[PDB]
Design a protein around this nucleic acid. Structure first.
Lengths: 57, 63
DNA sequence: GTTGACAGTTTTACGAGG
DNA sequence: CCTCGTAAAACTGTCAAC
């Protein structure tokens, strides 16, 4: 598991931007900062999130 | 370069709809598509260019 | 029952060269 | 504006490790 705080942050971002859930490169710097995850990890999270959470909506 | 943007399924659905009618776009339809999709005339010129690329490699065929 | 990861693939976006 | 090769952001299929 990722740390739960890193999840919450990205999920809160994800749901805030449901209609276009694609962070800008700058936004990825920031989420990776706040989470302590790497930029790859943030990218993989949103890839997996988009097909695992968004598309069902 | 300014980061690429995946098109909505509503958008894509439109293109293919017209691409199925003919594989090269006219200037009038390019305008109507652009209005319909909220996409630049350039973006759809390039989309059709890339769409034909894909079809040309579905010539496969001996598989 | 989910989840993070990644090799392999598809999708936007450009310039080269015509 | 076409066909082309190229890049690189995002997706697909997959699976051990939760």
């Amino acid at each position: 598991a990722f740390p739960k705080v890193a999840t919450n942050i990205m999920r809160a971002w994800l749901f805030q931007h449901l209609t276009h859930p694609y962070p800008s490169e700058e936004q990825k710097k920031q989420l990776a900062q706040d989470t302590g995850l790497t930029i790859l990890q943030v990218n993989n999270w949103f890839i997996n999130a988009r097909r695992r959470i968004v598309q069902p909506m | 370069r300014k980061k690429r943007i995946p098109y909505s399924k509503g958008q894509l659905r439109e293109l293919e709809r017209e691409y199925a009618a003919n594989k090269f776009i006219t200037k009038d339809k390019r305008r109507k598509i652009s209005a319909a999709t909220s996409l630049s005339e350039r973006q759809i010129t390039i989309w059709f260019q890339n769409r034909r690329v894909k079809e040309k490699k579905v010539l496969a065929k001996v598989k």
